[PDB]
Design a protein around this ligand. Structure first.
Ligand SMILES: *[C@@H]1O[C@H](CO)[C@@H](O)[C@H](O)[C@H]1NC(C)=O
Lengths: 221, 227, 499, 217
């Protein structure tokens, strides 16, 4: 199986530079051009460029011909996208990709890393409980969750009971507040009968601020 | 102009474009400060090399003294891609005269009826042993782009940016030295420059009409530039 | 492999070939032959020489009148260029070694497009001014490359000339230049003083420049040269020359060295070049748009301190886009300097004509398969998703081989065309349905099918069925051919009926 | 570039319907030698790489359900999806890989129509822990409703609120074809401790009349 993993994503000042990694496995690295594609949050797909590991040839979307660079290390089966003079509109998800043969465009992709070009400081979020209602219909359904508030930048991830609860979960799109700080809640619906018996922990992770939080949400006094 | 006649007098709107002190092309004075002409007439990007001569009958100015105007060029504004047009701005507006005069433009997008009388003017090649150097004129008639191409043997088909004119059965028309000058026609009492002379597929071939750039197609563009 | 194909042997050696209106025109010593496209039978011939040339006798007239031999020298007329024009009334334009390198135009009569004798005009106007210029002196006898193109409603000639210093106040030729035909058709014109870039008189003898090939692409004009690495260098290399396609003059003129290597064995001397689109598979392999022009060039190793080919060959591909990226973005100053042979070495300057210092490198695409051989000709075409090259050798050997970075390929077609070296002047024609190339060897020219020849090799149904699958060979009732050539309804890759 | 123009940008169709997306390119993607069009169709689920559906204009990729079909030639191409399923909610991208730079269409957002379904509404008071901070967040949950158009109005001691709240909506659910919504009221601790009743008032096509959920500080 072909596998592609990006790395190096994160926060970077406007004007600054950032090097993305793409480590490949499962094929002759030198026999396929390695492509980079990007997507701004909720926007279309834009093709960046590609390199040929065998000789280090490059091809760029005329837009990035000046500012962008692609490098390769055959010994590491890894490609590097190098960006400079980064600006606001470069904030995006960056995928690396390749193909099975000349018949297809891109057959394989990475997960993508998020590159945020901003001037804001990294801030870890606070995590507050969204405690289930006293009057949760007994025999019926209760709602509870987590307020993940005031962090930067994206993204944050929410699992419940360490991935063991997934049914009935809605982790919402984070919103950008006026302070320029992100905030989101994650809720889950649950049998009312389960309250006081079943432990509900939301597992929150913000890798940029390097903070993990497990908040147990329970009925209040 | 091959198989043309000398013009009996001056033609007010005729411009001789000089490159490195020699006549290189024709042009039409369409406004005090604007001459219309062809892209092929500019070998050099450096405007010091160019002069416009107005109110001249003889290409060397011989005999033209109290009428001739010599102006520098301050701007070249090229027509849209595929037009071969250039609008040349004079460093100093030309003074209108009996000898110096503008020629009207057509309405944008206007058509012209087939057997409409027209005239080409120019100081270019004539095939004469001793060209006197007096401005020449040849009379042509308009021809449908379709019918023009039927005479051209389907070797070339015409875009709407082109226009055709030619002598009925004889060979005559503009040639080397005539480029950028006007094809002029009058349906009504007024003269309009309907076409601009551009290099053709051979000078003065019998039964073979000339292709000109259709001014009425670029009329809108021209007006933005000159008003 | 032995095949019988449509062929033609001329009275003399063939220099150039041009295909127009289903007739084939041959530029040969002392003759222009007109052949039929179908069977290559001679339709007509035009005697261009020998001619009697002299100081007094003047260009574009016969001085056979006064063959008095006062100082008469007979000279064979070698064709240096042969061009078809259909912008003005259809014409053949032919320029020979004699008569100051002037050209002659053969105007086809309305219904007879194989008649080059009725109307023949010698292109010459006496230099009008007080001039040391000869716009009508087009072609050099030492070797010339003519690229013809219509631009701005004029016919423009871009010309590469090899020159010496045996020259006149009139009758100076130019190394590289652009000039246009007058609409009167009686002469050529240089538009400005920048319309030509010449080797300094001081170097014309010690610094020969050979012009292998020329082409347009991307709005640029490209010439390929062979020459010394340096003014006084004893070594030779290949360069690609780029300039703006304008007629007013040569602009943005830049020369760049081209190394074709094998993995560090340098093949420094280009023998022949062909530009075409890449087949689908190859395009992906080399990062090209199916859209993109590719320069395919067969290179050879020179003998030490020489431009003489050494019988070892490589084939490198140069995407124009790739080439352009190096021309376009200068990078290190250290790689660029004033054009050494145009300005002096010690010029104040040392528009601005420029040369690069380091060579742009590619890697043999045939993986050293042609190391012990001298490739002298190459054309290139697409078949399905494949890219195929037509190669010729110094020995008269012709080969068809698939081009790919993924593995080498034994030519599916390989046979001896002739005793004589295969000429680099080739033609590819795509009859939509199917296609052929015209290949020259000495005095003979041959019409080779682009596709079905692999099959014709097999003499029997059995052999034919055990042909390698990619050739798409099959048995049509009495012969081995590809599907498309079977007029007996029934074509097979599976069944041989009783013999 | 070669410009890619998808149409429409959005459409909302029912389960079992035939959907049609259109893709026009500024020049022919036809590779004449093999007579193949170099145009492809991707499907993109939120937070996921694009998945290749169709290549060479009409050739379905391995695995791809039979109901996806490409067609067209030259400059005009069509992605059809007969028998639309709920898991088919996504954004479809046409891409040409005929020349560089490769270019995609704007993408077409595809949503699933389904019977109207009223939301369950819940309300959350700020947490005491959060009040230690100095701010109060009041959360209102709108669970599993269709269609998306929903109005939430906050009320404190019965007064309407303006520009002190924000909402996010989840991506349609791949099997329910529903959305969920979250509305946060943000207030200073001062302004919060100064009032008594906090209500969230929802209007939806699924509710006979508006629904209110509230609590007392
Ligand atoms: C050349 O053509 C002649 C005339 O048909 C033919 O008989 C002969 O075999 C051909 N020669 C070769 C080498 O194909």
């Amino acid at each position: 199986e072909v596998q592609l993993v990006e790395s190096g994503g994160g926060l970077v000042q406007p004007g600054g530079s950032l090097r993305l990694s793409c480590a490949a496995s499962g094929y002759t690295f030198t026999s396929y051009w390695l492509h980079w594609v990007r997507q701004a949050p909720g926007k279309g797909l834009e093709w960046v460029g590609m390199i040929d590991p065998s000789n280090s040839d490059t091809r760029f979307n005329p837009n990035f011909k000046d500012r962008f660079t692609i490098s390769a290390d055959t010994s590491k089966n890894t490609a590097y996208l190098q960006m400079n003079s980064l600006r606001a509109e470069d904030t995006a998800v960056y995928y690396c990709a390749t193909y099975r043969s000349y018949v297809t465009p891109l057959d394989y992709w990475g997960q993508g890393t998020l590159v945020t070009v901003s001037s804001a400081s990294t801030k870890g979020p606070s995590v507050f409980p969204l405690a289930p209602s006293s009057k949760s219909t007994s025999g019926g359904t209760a709602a509870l969750g987590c307020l993940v508030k005031d962090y930067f930048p994206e993204p944050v991830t929410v699992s419940w009971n360490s991935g063991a609860l997934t049914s009935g979960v809605h982790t919402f799109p984070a919103v950008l507040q006026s302070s320029g700080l992100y905030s989101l809640s994650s809720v889950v619906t649950v049998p009312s009968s389960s309250l006081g018996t079943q432990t509900y922990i939301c597992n929150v992770n913000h890798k940029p601020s390097n903070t993990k939080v497990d908040k147990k949400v329970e009925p209040k006094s | 102009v091959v198989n043309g006649i000398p013009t009996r007098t001056n033609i007010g709107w005729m411009v001789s474009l000089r490159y490195r002190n020699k006549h290189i092309c024709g042009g039409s004075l369409i406004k005090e400060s604007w001459v219309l002409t062809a892209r092929q007439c500019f070998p050099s990007r450096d405007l010091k090399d160019y002069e416009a001569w107005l109110g001249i009958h003889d290409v060397h100015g011989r005999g033209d003294e109290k009428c001739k105007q010599v102006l520098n060029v301050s701007q070249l504004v090229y027509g849209p891609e595929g037009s071969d047009l250039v609008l040349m701005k004079l460093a100093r507006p030309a003074v209108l005269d009996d000898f110096v005069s503008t020629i009207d433009l057509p309405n944008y997008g206007s058509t012209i009826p087939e057997k409409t009388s027209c005239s080409v003017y120019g100081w270019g090649y004539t095939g004469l042993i001793n060209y006197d150097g007096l401005l020449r004129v040849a009379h042509l008639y308009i021809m449908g782009n379709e019918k023009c191409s039927q005479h051209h043997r389907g070797k070339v088909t015409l875009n709407e940016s082109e226009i055709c004119a030619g002598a009925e059965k004889i060979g005559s028309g503009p040639c080397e030295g005539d480029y950028g000058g006007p094809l002029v026609c009058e349906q009504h009492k007024m003269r309009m420059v309907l076409g601009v002379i551009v290099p053709g597929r051979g000078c003065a071939i019998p039964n073979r009409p000339g292709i000109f750039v259709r001014v009425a197609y670029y009329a809108k563009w021209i007006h933005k530039i000159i008003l | 492999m032995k095949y019988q194909l449509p062929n033609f042997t001329a009275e003399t050696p063939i220099q150039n070939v041009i295909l127009h209106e289903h007739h084939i025109f041959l530029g040969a010593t002392n003759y222009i032959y007109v052949l039929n496209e179908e069977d290559l039978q001679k339709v007509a011939e035009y005697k261009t020489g020998p001619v009697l040339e002299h100081p007094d006798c003047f260009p574009c007239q016969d001085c056979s009148s006064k063959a008095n031999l006062s100082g008469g020298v007979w000279k064979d007329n070698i064709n240096m260029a042969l061009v078809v024009d259909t912008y003005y009334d259809d014409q053949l334009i032919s320029c020979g070694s004699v008569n100051r390198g002037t050209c002659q135009r053969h105007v086809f009569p309305h219904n007879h497009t194989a008649d080059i004798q009725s109307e023949v005009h010698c292109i010459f106007s006496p230099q009008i001014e007080e001039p040391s210029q000869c716009p009508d002196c087009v072609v050099s006898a030492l070797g010339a490359k003519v690229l013809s193109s219509v631009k701005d409603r004029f016919i423009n000639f871009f010309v590469g000339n090899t020159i010496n210093s045996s020259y006149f106040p009139d009758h100076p030729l130019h190394s590289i230049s652009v000039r246009r035909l007058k609409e009167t058709k009686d002469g050529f014109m240089f538009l400005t003083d920048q319309s030509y870039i010449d080797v300094l008189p001081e170097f014309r003898d010690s610094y020969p420049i050979k012009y292998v090939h020329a082409f347009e692409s991307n709005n640029f004009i490209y010439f390929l040269t062979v020459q010394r690495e340096t003014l006084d260098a004893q070594t030779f290399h290949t360069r690609i020359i780029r300039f703006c396609s304008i007629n007013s003059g040569l602009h943005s003129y830049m020369e760049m060295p081209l190394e074709c290597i094998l993995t560090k064995e340098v093949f420094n001397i280009l023998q022949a070049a062909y530009v075409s689109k890449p087949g689908a598979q190859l395009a992906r392999q080399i990062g090209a748009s199916l859209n993109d022009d590719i320069l395919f060039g067969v290179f050879a190793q020179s003998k030490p301190d020489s431009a003489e080919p050494m019988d070892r060959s490589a084939m490198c591909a140069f995407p124009i886009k790739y080439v352009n990226d190096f021309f376009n973005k200068i990078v290190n100053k250290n790689n660029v300097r004033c054009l050494q042979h145009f300005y002096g070495p010690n010029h104040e300057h040392c528009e601005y004509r420029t040369e690069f210092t380091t060579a742009l490198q590619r890697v043999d695409l045939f993986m050293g398969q042609f190391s012990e051989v001298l490739l002298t000709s190459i054309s290139t075409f697409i078949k399905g998703d494949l890219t195929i090259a037509n190669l010729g050798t110094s020995e008269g050997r012709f080969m068809q081989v698939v081009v790919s970075r993924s593995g080498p390929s034994t030519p599916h077609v390989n046979f001896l065309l002739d005793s004589h070296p295969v000429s680099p002047e080739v033609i590819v024609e795509h009859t939509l349905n199917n296609g052929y190339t015209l290949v020259i060897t000495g005095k003979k020219i041959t019409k080779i099918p682009l596709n079905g020849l692999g099959c014709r090799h097999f003499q029997s149904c059995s052999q034919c069925l055990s042909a390698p699958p990619f050739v798409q060979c099959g048995w049509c009732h009495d012969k081995c051919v590809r599907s498309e050539e079977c007029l007996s309804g029934t074509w097979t890759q599976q069944i041989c009926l009783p013999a | 570039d070669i410009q890619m123009t998808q149409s429409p940008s959005s459409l909302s169709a029912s389960v079992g319907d035939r959907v049609t997306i259109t893709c026009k390119s500024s020049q022919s993607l036809l590779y004449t030698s093999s007579q193949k069009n170099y145009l492809a169709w991707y499907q993109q689920k939120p937070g996921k790489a694009p998945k290749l559906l169709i290549y060479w204009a009409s050739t379905r990729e391995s695995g791809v359900p039979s109901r996806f079909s490409g067609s067209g030639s030259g400059t005009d191409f069509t992605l059809t999806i007969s028998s639309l399923q709920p898991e088919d909610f996504a954004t479809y991208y046409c891409q040409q890989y005929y020349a560089y730079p490769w270019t995609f269409g704007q993408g077409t957002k595809v949503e699933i129509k389904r019977t109207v379904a009223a939301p369950s509404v819940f309300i959350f008071p700020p947490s005491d822990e959060q009040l230690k901070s100095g701010t109060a967040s009041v959360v209102c949950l709108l669970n599993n409703f269709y269609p998306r158009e929903a109005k939430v109005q906050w009320k404190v001691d019965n007064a309407l609120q303006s520009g002190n709240s924000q909402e996010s909506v989840t991506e349609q659910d791949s099997k329910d074809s529903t959305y969920s919504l979250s509305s946060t009221l943000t207030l200073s601790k001062a302004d919060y401790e100064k009032h008594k009743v906090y209500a969230c008032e929802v209007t939806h096509q699924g509710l006979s009349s508006p629904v209110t959920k509230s609590f007392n500080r």
